[PDB]
């Protein structure tokens, strides 16, 4: 299909209009007095969102030269959400500010490559100054603060998240999903849990609980289907001689063996339950080895040449209690050993280094959480689906933001950290005059986040901006209260990881865009 080509300012002008449309859409989500954007999805009810990247993803313009601009800055919002979850709008507002100044600098006739080298030098220094400003975040109050701020001033979410991370500990996994009540709820899972229930109702010994509970059971770990009672007879006999109950963990229990076990348990000869193994394939094998390690048991498998006809009470693991339901199994206080667990955890943690896939890494993180911590579910309480999907997205940011604080620290929020560092680099210089203006582009555009935060209040940005730059240290303006104060004592905090990430990626894409001289696209 034949191409269309444009040169110079007739090209760059088309480019700038595109970026401005997308950025102008995104800006309005910024800050605590921001407003929501409504996104059309034809499949159902429209979705209202405050999530910057969700708005950015949909924008794509009719006029092909205009469309190209939006498609570029869409990259920055995507990565910042991928890198650290929160921060997406701030990275966008930074990226638009630098672009608009860059076209300003190019029109003055600077060589665009020296401008790029200038920008890249200013960012390199600014990241080092941010690392110097960062201070540790280390307690529930600081964590509750950053949670509140990321939640858009919903103290309940901040409080709730501090409790959840306290209960499961740093190795614990926290998740959020759609609730049913009109108010939030926190469920914490402890010990080991997996999504497999009893294979028949007759095992149920506490029908009031609707569940199976066994005290001091043996646990058998069969790496294959169970097919005929003949494979198990000496185990049940050995177990029956010991008199303690038994839990079968196996890939399956076929009906005749199962029915024979069901018969024997109800008639009280020996007390037994059977569950399918969780997961599948190699991860099943690992998890079976994990439960064996946790229980101190042994994985019975033919690849090592073991036989169920030769299995003994030394091969079966133990736990103080197990509880199993229609759909669920839990093992309480497995009789493993600490040195083995940390070695097994160390293996998985090394595998976490090897897990290039983030989802698989999350599964590895879940596995170590099962061995060494807990798992929690936050249930989001809201009256309506169009609010469920709004509230949920804010809790998502609060979880990522609270996570981001603990490993890297926090800085004064409201952009004042990013204002302060800009004052320190004022002595920075380039090799040539073009690089000096390129440096100055960065120091000017870094004000743009605070300016937009204030502008959404309807305040006069330059009046506040002038007074904040007149301030010292963490002195800043609070747009919630519409008054100045100490951001640390006022509890307005940003994770250093998100603020640092929002600058680095923004300068990457903008540093290219100001150098564009030609675009080629298909005739409409």
């Amino acid at each position: 299909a034949a191409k269309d080509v444009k040169f110079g300012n007739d090209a760059r002008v088309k480019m700038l209009r595109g970026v401005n449309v997308l950025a102008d859409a995104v800006k309005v989500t910024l800050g605590p007095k921001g407003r929501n954007v409504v996104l059309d999805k034809s499949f159902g009810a429209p979705t209202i969102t405050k999530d910057g990247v969700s708005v950015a993803r949909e924008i794509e313009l009719e006029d092909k030269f205009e469309n190209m601009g939006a498609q570029m800055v869409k990259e920055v919002a995507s990565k910042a959400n991928d890198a650290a979850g929160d921060g997406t709008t701030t990275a966008t507002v930074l990226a638009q500010a630098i672009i608009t100044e860059g076209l300003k600098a190019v029109a003055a006739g600077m060589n665009p490559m020296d401008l790029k080298r200038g920008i890249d030098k200013a960012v390199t220094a600014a990241v080092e100054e941010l690392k110097a400003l960062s201070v540790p975040c280390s307690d529930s109050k600081a964590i509750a603060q950053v949670g509140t701020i990321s939640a858009n001033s919903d103290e309940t979410v901040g409080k709730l998240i501090a409790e959840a991370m306290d209960k499961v500990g740093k190795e614990g996994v926290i998740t959020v999903e759609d609730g049913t009540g009109l108010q939030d709820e926190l469920d914490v899972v402890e010990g080991m849990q997996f999504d497999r229930g009893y294979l028949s109702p007759y095992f149920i010994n506490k029908p009031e609980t609707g569940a199976v509970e066994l005290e001091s059971p043996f646990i058998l770990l069969a790496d294959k289907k169970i097919s005929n009672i003949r494979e198990m007879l000496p185990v049940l006999e050995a177990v029956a001689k010991a008199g303690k109950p038994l839990l079968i963990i196996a890939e399956d229990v076929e009906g005749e063996a199962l029915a024979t076990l069901v018969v024997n348990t109800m008639r009280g000869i020996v007390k037994v339950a059977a569950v399918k193994a969780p997961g599948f394939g190699d991860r099943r094998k690992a998890m079976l080895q994990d439960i064996a390690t946790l229980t101190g048991g042994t994985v019975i498998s033919e690849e090592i040449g073991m036989e169920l006809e030769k299995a003994t009470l030394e091969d079966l693991g133990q736990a103080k209690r197990v509880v199993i339901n229609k759909d669920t199994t839990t093992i309480i206080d497995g009789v493993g050993e600490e040195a083995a667990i940390q070695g097994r955890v160390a293996q998985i943690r090394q595998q976490i280094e090897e897990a290039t896939s983030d989802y698989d890494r999350e599964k590895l993180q879940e596995r170590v959480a099962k061995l060494a911590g807990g798992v929690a579910v936050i249930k989001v309480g809201a009256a309506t689906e169009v609010e469920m999907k709004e509230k949920k997205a804010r809790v998502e940011d609060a979880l990522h933001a609270t996570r981001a604080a603990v490993e890297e620290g926090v800085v004064a929020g409201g952009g004042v950290a990013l204002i302060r560092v800009a004052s320190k680099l004022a002595d920075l210089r380039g090799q040539n005059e073009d690089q000096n203006v390129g440096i100055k582009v960065a120091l000017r555009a870094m004000e743009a986040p605070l300016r937009q935060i204030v502008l959404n209040c309807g305040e006069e940005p330059s009046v506040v901006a002038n007074t904040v730059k007149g301030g010292d240290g963490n002195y800043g303006y609070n747009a919630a209260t519409e008054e100045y104060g100490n951001m640390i004592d006022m509890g307005i905090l940003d994770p250093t990881k998100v603020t640092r990430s929002a600058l680095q990626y923004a300068a990457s894409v903008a540093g290219l865009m100001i150098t564009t001289e030609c675009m080629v696209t298909d005739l409409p």
Binding site: S42, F43, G279, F280, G281, D282, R284, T356, S357, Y359
Partner: protein
């Protein structure tokens, strides 16, 4: 293409199977390395239906009814089970029965042109209990062969046939004579896969000569016999 909407694991296999809402295909599918499995299985479901490649539109964007869906997927067992809307398999005008060109197009053919599926071997499928009677369907089969052979229509058993000795290069009338000889024996034969109109033994003369050989063999045995002409 795409995985969004194509992941529909909420679809119950009971209403899909026993409710007949979808044709249900079980694939042993493995992606190429580094691809998301569920995305690949769902992305493979898109190739197994609408295609939906780069973009779909109807003067006003979107297209959402034709999609065949993954409804069970499990990466570590390589399982990809895809449920297909019955509308995918358009009815043949001769009988109202769905064109199987679609089914292959949507399982083991143009849909397999997906490259990040390393393989998707279907181990099984289901077809809706009722609309199954309106799948393309073998209006002739072993049971009708029994009928033309004069066997009972129940358990008429083995319709005996051969690959003609010595396979290729046997000229049409030697091939027909080998069919005649075989049909002094058993019941059924095929042309070989190269024995179309290929010049060593084209179809028309061979099938004319083979048909004569069948009638001759029938007359010399008192029992009916069959030939499978390579129409490919």
């Amino acid at each position: 293409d795409q995985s969004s909407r194509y992941v529909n694991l909420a679809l119950k296999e009971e209403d899909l199977i026993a409710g007949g809402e979808h044709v249900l295909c079980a694939y042993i599918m493995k992606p190429k390395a580094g691809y998301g499995y569920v995305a690949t299985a769902a992305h493979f479901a898109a190739e197994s239906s609408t295609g939906t490649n780069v973009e779909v539109c109807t003067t006003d964007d979107f297209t959402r009814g034709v999609d065949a869906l993954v409804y069970e997927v499990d990466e570590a067992r390589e399982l990809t089970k895809i449920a297909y809307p019955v509308a995918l398999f358009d009815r043949n005008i001769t009988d109202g029965k769905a064109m199987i060109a679609s089914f292959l197009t949507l399982t083991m053919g143009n849909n397999q042109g997906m490259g990040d599926v390393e393989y998707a071997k279907m181990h099984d499928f289901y077809v809706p209990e009722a609309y199954r009677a309106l799948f393309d369907g073998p209006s002739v089969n072993i049971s009708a062969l029994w009928k033309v052979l004069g066997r009972p229509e129940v358990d008429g058993g083995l319709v005996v046939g051969t690959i003609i000795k010595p396979k290729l290069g046997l000229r049409p009338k030697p091939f027909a004579e080998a069919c005649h000889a075989f049909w002094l024996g058993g019941d059924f034969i095929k042309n070989d896969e190269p024995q179309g109109n290929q010049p060593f033994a084209p179809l028309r003369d061979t099938i004319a000569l083979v048909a004569d050989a069948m009638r001759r063999a029938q007359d010399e045995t008192g029992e009916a016999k069959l030939f499978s002409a390579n129409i490919t």
